[PDB]
Ligand binder design. Structure first.
Ligand SMILES: O=S(=O)(O)C[C@@H](O)CO
Lengths: 206, 186
C-alpha cells in the first residue's frame, strides 16, 4: 500500500483525492489488526506471569511469541498459520456482519504446506494439529450471530450460522486436491461431534 | 431628470440610503422541508423544498410596482442559503450590522428563528463543513488559515463555500414561449 502510494502522482489534479485516501485507509487497517494482535502478545505474558501451573505458563509464553510474529510477519509453522487465520477471521467480525458469520475457506489447502513441514520435521503431530483445529471450533461456538432486526431473527432462527470450512475438491490446475489434512478434518468431525465447524466438502467427477 | 418617471423614482427614493435587512423566510421554509426528506435524491428534495417555500412564504407586490413578486420583505434585503455556509452564522450574525464591509441589519425575531431553528439543523450538514473536513493536509496550508476553515489564507482560495454555483443564465424564452404547464406535461 505504501509503495502504491509513493507511485501516485501527487502533483496532478486527481490522485491525491481519487486514490490516496484509499491507500491511507489500507495502511491504517493494516496497523489496526497488527496493534490488536500485539496487545494479545502482552496479555499472554502477563497471564503467564500470573499462572502458577508450569505447563500452562509455557503454553501462554509460546502463545506470546506466536502473537508477536503473526499476522505482522509471515507464519513460520502450522501453529502460527492457524493463529494468523484466527486473527483475520476474528478481526473480520469486528469489521462487519458478513452473512452466516465469516467463512473460513479451503483450510485443508492453505494449511497443508505448514502441516506437512512441521509433521516431517517432528515439531507437530496430527493429534496436536487436530487439537488446535478443535480449539478453533469451541471458541467459534461462543460467537453467536445476534440479529436485532426481527426479519433477520426469523430468517436465521435458533442462532443459525454457517461458518463454512472447505475441504477437498480440485487444485487450480484441475486435479484432485485431497491431502492428509482433508482426512484429518473428517476424522475430527466424527471424533468430536459438534455443530461447529460447518464442514463442507467439494466433490468432482474424479 | 425625473420627467415621466414618477413611479420608478418613488420606488427608488424609499430604498436608497437604507441598510439592507436579512430576510429568513426562504431559508426557513427550505430548511423545514429538507429536514424531512433526508436520503432522497437531492434534486427531488430540493423541488419539494421549493414547493414548501412557494406555499408558505410571504408573497409581495412592492408598493406602486407594475411587477409582482419579491423573495423577501420590503426595503433592501438579502436572503440566506445555510446549505452553503450555515456553520458561519454563530460567528457572523452578531457582527453583521457593524461589518465594515457591506453591513446588514437583522430583526430580533428573525434572528431568533435563524439561530434557534434554522442554524441548528444545518450543523454537520453544510457544504463548507464538509469541504473543510476532507481537504487533504497537503492542500490546507494554502487554503485555510484556521482549523475550522472560517478564515481563508488568501493564497489559493476556494470560492464554493460562499455561493451555491457559478453565475447562470436560465432559458427565459422557453418559459415564456411554453409555460410551465407544457414543460410539466413534458
Ligand atoms: O463566473 S463566476 O466565477 O461564477 C462570477 C463572475 O462572473 C462574476 O462575479
Amino acid at each position: 500500500a505504501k509503495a502504491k502510494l509513493a507511485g501516485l502522482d501527487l502533483t496532478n489534479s486527481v490522485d491525491i483525492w481519487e486514490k490516496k485516501p484509499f491507500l491511507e485507509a489500507m495502511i491504517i487497517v493494516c496497523d489496526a489488526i497488527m496493534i490488536w494482535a500485539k496487545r494479545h502478545a502482552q496479555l499472554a505474558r502477563d497471564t503467564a506471569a500470573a499462572t502458577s501451573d508450569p505447563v500452562r505458563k509455557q503454553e501462554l509464553l509460546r502463545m506470546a511469541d506466536i502473537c508477536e510474529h503473526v499476522p505482522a510477519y509471515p507464519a513460520r509453522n502450522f501453529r502460527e498459520a492457524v493463529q494468523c487465520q484466527w486473527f483475520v477471521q476474528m478481526f473480520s467480525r469486528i469489521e462487519q456482519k458478513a452473512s452466516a458469520i465469516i467463512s473460513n475457506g479451503r483450510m485443508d489447502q492453505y494449511l497443508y504446506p505448514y502441516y506437512k513441514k512441521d509433521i516431517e520435521e517432528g515439531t507437530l503431530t496430527s493429534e496436536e494439529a487436530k487439537e488446535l483445529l478443535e480449539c478453533m471450533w469451541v471458541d467459534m461456538a461462543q460467537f453467536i450471530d445476534l440479529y436485532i432486526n426481527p426479519t433477520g431473527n426469523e430468517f436465521q432462527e435458533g442462532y443459525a450460522h454457517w461458518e463454512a470450512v472447505t475441504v477437498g475438491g480440485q487444485t487450480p490446475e484441475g486435479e484432485d486436491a485431497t491431502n492428509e489434512l482433508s482426512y484429518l478434518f473428517l476424522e475430527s468431525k466424527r471424533e468430536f461431534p459438534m455443530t461447529y465447524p460447518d464442514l463442507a466438502v467439494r466433490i468432482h467427477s474424479r | 431628470n425625473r420627467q415621466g418617471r414618477e413611479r420608478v423614482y418613488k420606488i427608488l427614493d424609499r430604498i436608497q440610503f437604507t441598510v439592507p435587512h436579512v430576510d429568513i423566510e426562504r431559508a426557513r421554509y427550505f430548511t423545514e422541508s429538507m429536514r424531512q426528506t433526508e436520503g432522497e435524491l437531492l434534486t427531488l428534495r430540493w423541488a419539494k423544498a421549493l414547493k414548501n417555500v412557494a406555499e408558505k412564504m410571504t408573497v409581495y407586490i412592492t408598493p406602486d410596482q407594475l411587477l409582482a413578486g419579491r423573495v423577501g420583505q420590503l426595503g433592501r434585503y438579502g436572503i440566506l442559503y445555510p446549505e452553503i455556509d450555515g456553520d458561519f452564522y454563530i460567528e457572523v450574525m452578531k457582527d453583521l450590522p457593524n461589518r465594515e464591509k457591506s453591513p446588514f441589519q437583522i430583526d430580533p425575531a428573525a434572528a431568533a428563528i435563524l439561530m434557534e431553528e434554522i442554524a441548528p439543523y444545518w450543523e454537520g450538514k453544510t457544504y463548507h463543513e464538509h469541504l473543510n473536513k476532507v481537504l487533504p493536509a497537503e492542500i490546507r496550508g494554502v487554503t485555510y488559515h484556521d482549523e475550522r476553515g472560517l478564515k481563508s489564507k488568501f493564497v489559493v482560495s476556494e470560492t464554493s463555500s460562499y455561493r451555491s454555483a457559478l453565475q447562470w443564465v436560465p432559458d427565459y424564452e422557453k418559459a415564456m414561449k411554453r409555460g410551465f404547464i407544457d414543460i410539466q406535461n413534458e
